[PDB]
Amino acid sequence: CTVAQLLKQNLLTFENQRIQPEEELKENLTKVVNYFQAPIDVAVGYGSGVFRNPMIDFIFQVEDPVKWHKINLQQNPSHYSFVKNFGPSTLQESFGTGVYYNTHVEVEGNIIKYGVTSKKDVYEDLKNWNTMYLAGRFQKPVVILKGEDEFYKENSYNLSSALHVGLLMLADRFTEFDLYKTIVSLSYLGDIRMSFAAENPRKVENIVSKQIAFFRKLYLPLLYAEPGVHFIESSEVLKSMDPSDNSRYLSFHQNITKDSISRLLNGLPLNL
Amino acid sequence: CTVAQLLKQNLLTFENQRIQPEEELKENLTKVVNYFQAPIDVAVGYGSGVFRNPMIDFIFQVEDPVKWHKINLQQNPSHYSFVKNFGPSTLQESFGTGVYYNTHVEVEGNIIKYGVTSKKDVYEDLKNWNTMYLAGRFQKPVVILKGEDEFYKENSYNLSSALHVGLLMLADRFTEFDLYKTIVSLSYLGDIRMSFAAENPRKVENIVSKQIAFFRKLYLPLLYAEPGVHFIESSEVLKSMDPSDNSRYLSFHQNITKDSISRLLNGLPLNL
């Protein structure tokens, strides 16, 4: 594969999001997601365990959390930290909100950490950016183990919106490195608040530099299709560049008018 | 004044925050602030009307919004956009929330736009970062027309925490430009969501470059006092540098250990 092939990716089938891991590592993560009996609608993998002893982080989007946590309690009560009372407690309030994390849980010889959240509040964030605490996590390279094509359709507008905010911040001439570092800076605090990011946070430069091939697969097709954003490098260097190359970063030019900025600004989910 | 003088600023008296404008513009601003009959506790000035026809932006922090708006309604009812009902109807739900804005208002020959919010909820954000929508605004150069010494004390931990997040994101060697651009990237989306930022948003490089003298007054003393962060430039060039000089950007080195990053991380308000 080459960087030029990344530009002609089918955006209507969401080919830019179809990031699959190593064939050995793939079904190893399917082994741990098919282990759970409770119905998982969308399974997400991310972190140092997926994008390579390390712990593999997961996100489980569920039809509804109270019933999912019920069945998982019957299957794996050792994952939780329960309370035994002396009286004849809390039933729904503990599981009905936010994302519930279970850390350092062994499943198939893998130390896993999975957060369970409502699929509805993820989709609402992916299209409205109510808090962007969830959407910001998916503006970065992730692996979808289950429910892929349904999730790609909902995240496409989120990815597009992320690039638009980047174009709003960067000037006339910018490099792809400045763009990825900017997109990462948007969700940095939110990923710390949601316990998404590495348990000890990494540097912005290191996040992008080590995942440059997947940041390109995500956003380079959106840059090629975005009207008014021109590639400066010729097609000869794009056909000869490996996506994981950090020796050269592509530079861009964008048309910056009063109408272009207002078009970018008004096409995002967070304006009244 | 020189960049070297900015390094030995009295942090105990919050001298790094005491940003006062031109003497002619300062009296022109307090004439607008003192015009309001309702009691304003902390008057904030920001935007292109303060850091220079343009509209001047304000933020009024009040002890209680419902009784503040009642006094301002009977004094300036033309500022608001009221409703008239045919029946003999909200009362408190319209003002006991968020920040209420009145846009394109003349006060004293100046077209101004002032937002009113609870001083209690500002201090809750300046200390805990519940949403950082309000705190992110004061991580950037602002002018305090009223309630300075009481506001500076509450914002000092906010500024210090902002620099710590920047150090979490920047690598071993970084420039002051990289630090300011990163700090701005943290509050960029939050300022759009709160209508703080200019009604047409500006590029990050322009926000920093045109305000470099005040970003230096804010954060250079904090970098001097921060343990493990050393200035690379010699004291001879710091004594010959004007704070508003964009020709040279100071570079830094920081010591990056697992205990240094954990100290920065756990010293922040947003982790349970």
Terminal-residue alpha carbon distance, chain B: 42
Mutate to test the interface with A, among B164, B169, B174, B183 (most CBs of A within 10 A): B169
Q: What are phi and psi of B226, to 5 degrees?
A: -70, 120
Q: How far apart are CA B250 and CA B232, in angstroms?
A: 7
Q: How far apart are CA B142 and CA B136, in angstroms?
A: 11
Query: Do A186 and B189 lie within an 8 Å CB cutoff?
Result: yes
| Strands annotated E in chain A | 42-46, 56-62, 100-106, 111-118, 143-146, 173-175, 229-231, 251-254
- Output the CA–CA distances (angstroms, integers) from residue A191 to A29, A132, A139, B183, B209, in the order listed: 22, 10, 11, 16, 29
- Where is A33: in which H helix or E strand? helix A23-33
Residue A152 CA neighbour count, 13 Å, CB half: 18
Query: Do A170 and B261 lie within an 8 Å CB cutoff?
Result: no
Looking at beta carbons, which residues of chain A come within 8 Å of B185?
Answer: 169, 182, 185-186
Beta strand B42-46 pairing with B56-62: antiparallel
Helices (H), A65-175: 65-75, 119-128, 135-138, 148-169
| CB-nearest partner of B204 from A132, A169, A206 | A169
- Where is B104: in which H helix or E strand? strand B100-106
- Output the CA–CA distances (angstroms, integers) from residue B272 to B129, B155, B166, in the order listed: 11, 21, 20
Residues of B with CB under 8 A from a CB of A: 132, 165, 168-171, 182, 185-186, 188-189, 192-193, 200-201, 203-206, 258, 261-262, 265, 268, 270-271
Size of interface A-B (CB pairs under 8 A): 66
Query: Do B171 and A203 lie within an 8 Å CB cutoff?
Result: yes
Q: How far apart are CA A151 and CA B158, in angstroms?
A: 37
Residues of A with CB under 8 A from a CB of B: 132, 165, 168-171, 182, 185-186, 188-189, 192-193, 200-201, 203-206, 258, 261-262, 265, 270-271
Looking at beta carbons, which residues of chain B come within 8 Å of A168?
Answer: 201, 203
Query: Does residue A98 come out as left (phi exceeding 0), alpha (psi in the -120 to 50 range) or beta?
Result: left
The 8-class DSSP code of residue B8 comes to T
- Where is A32: in which H helix or E strand? helix A23-33
Amino acid at residue number B13: T
Looking at beta carbons, which residues of chain B come within 8 Å of A204?
Answer: 169-170, 182
Q: How far apart are CA A197 and CA A214, in angstroms?
A: 17
* Residues A40, A117 contacting (CB under 8 angstroms): no
CB environment A109-146: b (16+ within 10 A), e (fewer) = eeebbbbbbbbebbbbbbbebebbbbbbbbbbbbbbbb
Task: Name the residue among A162, A84, A167, A155 with its Cα closest to residue A123.
Answer: A155
Residues across chain A: 272
Contacting residues for B127 by C-beta, under 8 A, at least 6 apart:
B154, B157, B158, B269
Give me B81's structure tokens. Answer: 């956009």
B193 to chain A: closest CA residue: A270
B270 to chain A: closest CA residue: A193
Query: Does residue A8 come out as left (phi exceeding 0), alpha (psi in the -120 to 50 range) or beta?
Result: alpha
Looking at beta carbons, which residues of chain B come within 8 Å of A182?
Answer: 185, 204
| CB-nearest partner of A185 from B185, B201, B205 | B185
| CB-nearest partner of B186 from A189, A200, A261 | A189
Q: What are phi and psi of A20, to 5 degrees?
A: -110, 145
